[PDB]
Design a protein around this ligand. Structure first.
Ligand SMILES: *[C@@H]1O[C@H](CO)[C@@H](O[C@@H]2O[C@H](CO)[C@@H](O[C@@H]3O[C@H](CO[C@H]4O[C@H](CO)[C@@H](O)[C@H](O)[C@@H]4O)[C@@H](O)[C@H](O[C@H]4O[C@H](CO)[C@@H](O)[C@H](O)[C@@H]4O)[C@@H]3O)[C@H](O)[C@H]2NC(C)=O)[C@H](O)[C@H]1NC(C)=O
Ligand SMILES: *[C@@H]1O[C@H](CO)[C@@H](O[C@@H]2O[C@H](CO)[C@@H](O)[C@H](O)[C@H]2NC(C)=O)[C@H](O)[C@H]1NC(C)=O
Ligand SMILES: *[C@@H]1O[C@H](CO)[C@@H](O)[C@H](O)[C@H]1NC(C)=O
Ligand SMILES: *[C@@H]1O[C@H](CO)[C@@H](O)[C@H](O)[C@H]1NC(C)=O
Ligand SMILES: *[C@@H]1O[C@H](CO)[C@@H](O)[C@H](O)[C@H]1NC(C)=O
Ligand SMILES: *[C@@H]1O[C@H](CO)[C@@H](O)[C@H](O)[C@H]1NC(C)=O
Ligand SMILES: *[C@@H]1O[C@H](CO)[C@@H](O)[C@H](O)[C@H]1NC(C)=O
Ligand SMILES: *[C@@H]1O[C@H](CO)[C@@H](O)[C@H](O)[C@H]1NC(C)=O
Ligand SMILES: *[C@@H]1O[C@H](CO)[C@@H](O)[C@H](O)[C@H]1NC(C)=O
Ligand SMILES: *[C@@H]1O[C@H](CO)[C@@H](O)[C@H](O)[C@H]1NC(C)=O
Ligand SMILES: *[C@@H]1O[C@H](CO)[C@@H](O)[C@H](O)[C@H]1NC(C)=O
Ligand SMILES: *[C@@H]1O[C@H](CO)[C@@H](O)[C@H](O)[C@H]1NC(C)=O
Ligand SMILES: *[C@@H]1O[C@H](CO)[C@@H](O)[C@H](O)[C@H]1NC(C)=O
Ligand SMILES: *[C@@H]1O[C@H](CO)[C@@H](O)[C@H](O)[C@H]1NC(C)=O
Lengths: 126, 213, 203, 125, 207, 213
């Protein structure tokens, strides 16, 4: 009946990737096991960010499979709603950080430069 | 080649309805009826054809000058949280017109909320009990809910507003017994993300007399 | 070669899933073994549930981890000393594919209102912090000819506890017939529990 | 004198990478500009997580430069202290998520499977 | 070819940095141009600070964005209509390389204690970018009673001890003759640069 | 080849000191002195040689049976937040012994805190004023700090403990005037990450007499 739009589309991708086969149960879990260890939202957002960034990269690889484009882009928007709270700036800043190439010589020089002020505010505000 | 684009499109966001309408496109030399194609896209996404698989209704190469996304079934249509952008064009075979792109909308943010439905009032001793239906059924109450206001006043008196209250039933306590009171019910859609509220339309006036004892 | 079983299905009520299957009649009486494989356990392999059993069912309530975690069931047949190929079932999520009992409703009068108690279904009996629980209660209250749907969220500490949920509806002295039925909606898949037995009261 | 251990080691890497030249100022900022947009810790940790994963990735490529190994792993420990609150489990869970290959066919099937229950708890309680 | 300047240095006090350089004496009077380039500005380009100036200094307080953001300074010389190559300086962080004034100390007696007021240096109080990394995190307050000194630490984040105008420390005292001399210094947030030590203020217990 | 490993190593974590010691290794046929090598590692790190470049003290190829990390200069040694693991071995040219690996330590977590230094007590009207120095100087007070406890009692009386208090000066108000009181000062190191505490050692007992009025 009434269920969040991702459920319908997520199980559609489940069939396309054969994620319903009994062989997926092998070799533990990627995200579900870790996420149960961290109940504090600060810890969760640290882990969820890496998980959300993972799905966006995965969907980017299958942007050419037009069979699943409907299911993919619906889940992407629901992630934009649940995780980024529909904040377009939050979504756009997130995408910039991901796309930085760690082999771009200019990027690492700027990264090494900004390191001090990044470490300066890694700890929570007083 | 090139055709004239559809004229003056409108997005009707009333209650749970989602209807896109436009003025038809005609030619002087018209051989067959012109069809239209509607497409939707999310904030940073690809354009999709509005077809039975994508949205559950057939809105491409259709003869009608409107398309109702919410007609098929409950919860069908675009999710009320999503940021949806629509565009439209008229085409006659190989010929097609320019894309008429609508402004972006989020359902909770742009909806025109109607009055509460099926209002029933029963008198009590110096009070009036009001039971009513919600303006529309929301899937997730945690993300959005309704706040109701009752505008009550004695006949020929100054306005008084009781509210807001979450429940669909309220008691108008502390009223003058055996006196006529008139009331109006008005809802308010609250979306926690928006931190701005949508003021719903008021219902018709209806006056009732309280009991004696 | 011993034939493989057919039509493997899983039916769960109150998170107690049972595996069913069909087998052809044969001169000998065949025995079966039922194996379960859960998602979300380290080094997951097929766990034996029922061993060399002669009937066509197997209760796997003990093999239910998270009611929102998928699980698979396969069954093979043994006749004499020769066994058959496995008959694997579709993935089964107790929260999605299963069904939950109705909540218990209690009604009582007060001076200016009616207190409706919505007791959680018998599943959530203390006697594990899973995704599968109730998020909203659809409480249908019919007063005379018309019924209006209410929504009570479990997250509201002021309206629900772990043992009960309450809703207060104002009433008047005139003749009125209030009939109340309530159902629960699950968090992830929106699966609706069975509708409660409609309890009424009159003024 | 008294300063967090990263400062001494971070500016040593600046000299090694020539991050002190005036040409580094070009092309805006990577991290500093974004980090000033988000003051709420929930929003910060979302961004900082991607930044911390970036530095760990960068350090992993230069694990063979013995000139900077002391400075590199000293900064790593200070990150283990400041960002992970010296929680080894937090550090190890973070390291696991990063090492997941998005092209491993087995990994994406499991990711598509767990997607439903991940989305279920993306929003705050 | 006109020679390029030499020995470019930057000295900052109270976040007011001055650029200095040396140049050889010549028959004509040469003029210089000083250009600043900050880190953290989109499409960063060199900003002119002093243009065709004849002396060997240039106050660039207006070109200070974030006191914790690096900035670079280069200067060239012009004689007649011919110019020289630029003389670039090392990177300069106002918070790291600069120096901050001392705090102002006030002392006053009460019935059972002494209330020491530590007013922040005049840089941070005014009516020069705000919301910066660069501020004081702890105050090292040294209290010498007769011969002996004990170090105190007052954290800026403590709302009960510090506000935007001052920081306070309460020390209990007795009736016997005592000489309390107090000096205080501030420590910067990231680089730990210590401000100048305050002028020692004393007080005596005559009763 | 192979040598006997150093015997009974110990890590002294007292106040701000960080000293690794061990029993010497001897041979029957010994022509020249045996040296030792100390190495340190972080939680998920590489082993580093303890040399003047790495840690500021030379603890590689050393004849001594100890290695003092905090002796060189103020702020020297391992950061008190860090998870540090040390290992040790004896070597004689090509021959060396097995690695003796110490248990991991975090200084705030494993330190044995000493008593407050330079305690001075001055009597007051029905009171005693206590000023003392901190057991050691902490770089970041927000990460770790001291809580002080004063164990005071009248001569022939029962113990009373005032505390805890953050300041290095305290007033023992409400005391019997012109009476002798004996006191002890004891510190308590609190690390907010661990939310577990290090109980410091108490100072010597010292008795003082309060003022007249
Ligand atoms: C400060 O830093 C130290 C050093 O890194 C940490 O101590 C280590 O902590 C890790 C856990 O993060 C330990 O790793 C464990 O090792 C086990 C095997 O090692 C044992 O046996 C060898 C001898 O061969 C010795 O090293 C030692 O006696 C060990 O006891 C593994 O079996 C463990 O894995 C198991 O558990 C995990 C988690 O449940 C599962 O995922 C695995 O599948 C497996 O079941 C584990 O990897 C390591 O042994 C510790 N070293 C020491 C010397 O103690 C401190 O924890 C750290 N302190 C803080 C506060 O951060
Ligand atoms: C919803 O998505 C639309 C489509 O991107 C956003 O509208 C446009 O956004 C771009 C980029 O931010 C702007 O350049 C346009 O000016 C926007 N259009 C209009 C008419 O303003 C819209 O901002 C999104 N909504 C939210 C709340 O983020
Ligand atoms: C599980 O991992 C092993 C290697 O670690 C691999 O051989 C195996 O194929 C994996 N399981 C599945 C179902 O792919
Ligand atoms: C959509 O409706 C139109 C009616 O004008 C019809 O011609 C067209 O074939 C329909 N499309 C599909 C896919 O059925
Ligand atoms: C919805 O409202 C927003 C803000 O008022 C506006 O920017 C947007 O254009 C509106 N959308 C439509 C379709 O009117
Ligand atoms: C309210 O008044 C309108 C007239 O504008 C009418 O159409 C509508 O039916 C009335 N509502 C009810 C419940 O009668
Ligand atoms: C198995 O199920 C199918 C479809 O439901 C049905 O046609 C068939 O008769 C079943 N087989 C048996 C043995 O009941
Ligand atoms: C299955 O077995 C469990 C105990 O192992 C029992 O509690 C449960 O009721 C059984 N299921 C049914 C349907 O009886
Ligand atoms: C800045 O980026 C441009 C391309 O976007 C590049 O050509 C240029 O070299 C970069 N700046 C520096 C200092 O490398
Ligand atoms: C310039 O600096 C160098 C090195 O610091 C010094 O030897 C030289 O004397 C300086 N020249 C002048 C003119 O100050
Ligand atoms: C530098 O200039 C600023 C603003 O122009 C001024 O406030 C400051 O006093 C000047 N400093 C010096 C040393 O001249
Ligand atoms: C370290 O000290 C020992 C003293 O036994 C000495 O032999 C050795 O040369 C020293 N190492 C260095 C690098 O100075
Ligand atoms: C330090 O303390 C921890 C527990 O707090 C303990 O596991 C460890 O062995 C201790 N290390 C030393 C060197 O005492
Ligand atoms: C405390 O007593 C010990 C004797 O055990 C002595 O060595 C030490 O100096 C005394 N401390 C003071 C401050 O007098």
């Amino acid at each position: 009946g009434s269920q969040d739009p991702y459920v319908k589309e997520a199980e559609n991708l489940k069939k396309y990737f054969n994620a319903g086969h009994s062989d997926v149960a092998d070799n533990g879990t990627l995200f579900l096991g870790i996420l149960k260890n961290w109940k504090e939202e600060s810890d969760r957002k640290i882990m969820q960010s890496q998980i959300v960034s993972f799905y966006f990269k995965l969907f980017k690889n299958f942007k050419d499979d037009q069979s699943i484009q409907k299911s993919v882009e619906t889940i992407k928007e629901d992630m934009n709603v649940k995780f980024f709270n529909s904040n377009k700036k939050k979504r756009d800043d997130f995408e910039k950080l991901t796309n930085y190439s760690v082999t771009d010589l200019n990027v690492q020089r700027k990264a090494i430069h900004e390191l001090i002020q990044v470490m300066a505010e890694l700890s929570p505000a007083a | 080649s090139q055709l004239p684009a559809p004229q003056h499109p409108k997005i009707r966001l009333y209650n749970a309805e989602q209807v896109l309408s436009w003025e038809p496109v005609a030619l002087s030399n018209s051989t067959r009826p012109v069809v239209y194609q509607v497409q939707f896209k999310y904030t940073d996404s690809k354009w999709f054809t509005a077809d039975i698989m994508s949205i559950g209704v057939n809105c491409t190469q259709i003869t009608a000058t409107e398309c109702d996304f919410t007609a098929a079934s409950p919860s069908a249509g675009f999710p009320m949280d999503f940021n949806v952008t629509l565009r439209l064009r008229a085409e006659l075979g190989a010929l097609h017109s320019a894309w008429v792109t609508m402004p972006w909308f989020q359902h909770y943010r742009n909806v025109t909320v109607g009055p509460p439905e099926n209002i029933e009032v029963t008198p009590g001793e110096g009070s009036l009990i009001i039971r009513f239906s919600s303006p529309f059924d929301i899937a997730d109450t945690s993300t959005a809910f309704f706040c109701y206001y009752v505008h009550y006043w004695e006949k020929g008196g100054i306005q008084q507003v009781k509210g807001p209250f979450r429940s669909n039933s309220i008691s108008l306590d502390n009223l003058k017994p055996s006196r006529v009171y008139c009331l109006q019910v008005q809802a308010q859609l609250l979306w926690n993300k928006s931190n701005i509220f949508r003021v719903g339309h008021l219902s018709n006036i209806s006056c009732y007399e309280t009991m004696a004892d | 070669s011993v034939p493989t079983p057919t039509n493997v299905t899983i039916e769960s009520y109150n998170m107690n899933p049972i595996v069913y299957w069909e087998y052809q009649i044969m001169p000998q009486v065949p025995v079966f073994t039922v194996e379960v494989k859960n998602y979300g356990v380290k080094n997951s392999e097929w766990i034996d549930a029922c061993i060399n059993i002669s009937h066509h069912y197997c209760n796997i309530s003990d093999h239910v981890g998270d009611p929102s975690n998928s699980l698979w069931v396969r069954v093979k047949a043994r006749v004499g000393q020769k066994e058959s190929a496995y008959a694997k079932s579709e993935e089964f999520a107790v929260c999605r594919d299963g069904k939950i009992g109705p909540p218990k409703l209690d009604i009582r009068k007060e001076e200016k209102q009616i207190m409706i108690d919505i007791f959680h279904p018998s599943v959530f009996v203390n006697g594990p912090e899973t995704i599968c629980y109730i998020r909203v209660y659809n409480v249908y209250v019919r007063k005379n000819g018309s019924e209006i749907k209410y929504k009570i969220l479990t997250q509201n500490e002021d309206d629900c506890d772990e043992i009960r949920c309450q809703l207060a509806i104002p009433v008047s002295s005139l003749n009125s017939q209030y009939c109340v039925s309530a159902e629960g909606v699950l968090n992830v898949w929106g699966v609706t529990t069975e509708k409660s037995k409609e309890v009424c009261i009159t003024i």
